[PDB]
Amino acid sequence: AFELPSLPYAIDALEPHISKETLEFHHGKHHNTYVVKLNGLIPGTKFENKSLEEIVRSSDGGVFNNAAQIWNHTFYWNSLSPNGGGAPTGAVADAINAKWGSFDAFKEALNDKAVNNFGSSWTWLVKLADGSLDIVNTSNAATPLTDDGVTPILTVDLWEHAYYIDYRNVRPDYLKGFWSLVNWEFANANFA
């Protein structure tokens, strides 16, 4: 049924911010496992011939947890780039300034939401129905893809497997890696 998307860059392209080993396990195993598990759940069911987004928005229990984790992870690989990092640009840079006054204040605000996102979770940059940006946290497999009026723009995966190999317990070190990789091209494509 579903397939594991290719990573949008080479396996060592995010070094030294996220390691080759971390991509091998995180994409090659964790992401892959949600694809396998979902493909094992849907045969014969009403979800069999639906798209992944259709399934995320219409399921609960294990079908949701795997489908939403497939979507979220694909969204996360796209939120990183060997050519990202640095200051934001475009429409998204101006929208960050509009909501938080400055890029630096926005970074401080997302870092605080990310470090304190308790347990397995995701911290997101979203665009609300009034066109303004905000940061929201979700837990486990939950995702703003299911929230009316809310458009995902960027995400940071805070389940421990996302960073434990490279950073152990220090999420602030992982976030410094994320800011070095953040894909503003994908953020602007989503915003626009």
Ligand X SMILES: OC[C@H]1O[C@H](O[C@H]2O[C@H](CO)[C@@H](O)[C@H](O)[C@H]2O)[C@H](O)[C@@H](O)[C@@H]1O
CB nearer to ligand X: pick between 102 and 116: 116
Q: Which of residues 35-54 bind its own copies (CB under 8 A)?
A: none
In angstroms, give the least distance from the CB of 114 to Fe ion: 14
d(CA 112, CA 117): 9
Residue window 163-182: x/- pattern of binding to ligand X, with contact defined by CB under 6 A: --------------------
What would the DSSP string read from start to end of 95-152?
HHHHHHSSHHHHHHHHHHHHHT--SSEEEEEEE-TTS-EEEEEEETT--GGGSTT-EE
In angstroms, give the least distance from the CB of 178 to Fe ion: 13
> Token pair for residue 56?
């995320």
Q: Is 188 helix (H, G, I), strand (E, B) or coil?
A: helix
Show Cβ contacts of residue 4 under 8 Å, excluding neighbours closer than 6 positions: 27, 31, 32, 35
117 binds, among its own copies, ligand X, Fe ion, none (CB under 5 to 8 A by kind): ligand X
d(CA 140, CA 157): 10
Q: Which listed residue (20, 29, 46, 176) binds its own copies by CB under 8 A?
A: 29
The answer to whether the annotation marks 17 as part of a ligand binding site is: no
Check residue 119 for interaction with ligand X (CB under 6 A). Answer: yes
Question: Binding residues for Fe ion, per CB under 5 A?
Answer: 157, 159, 162
150 binds, among ligand X, its own copies, Fe ion, none (CB under 5 to 8 A by kind): none
Question: Roughly what angle, to the nearest 10 degrees, separates helices 90-100 and 103-115?
Answer: 80
Contact 16, 59 (CB under 8 A): no
Check residue 11 for interaction with its own copies (CB under 8 A). Answer: no
Where is the binding site for Fe cation, in residues? 26, 73, 157, 161
Residues that bind its own copies (CB under 8 A): 25, 29-30, 33, 65, 118-120, 139-141, 159-161, 164-165, 168-169
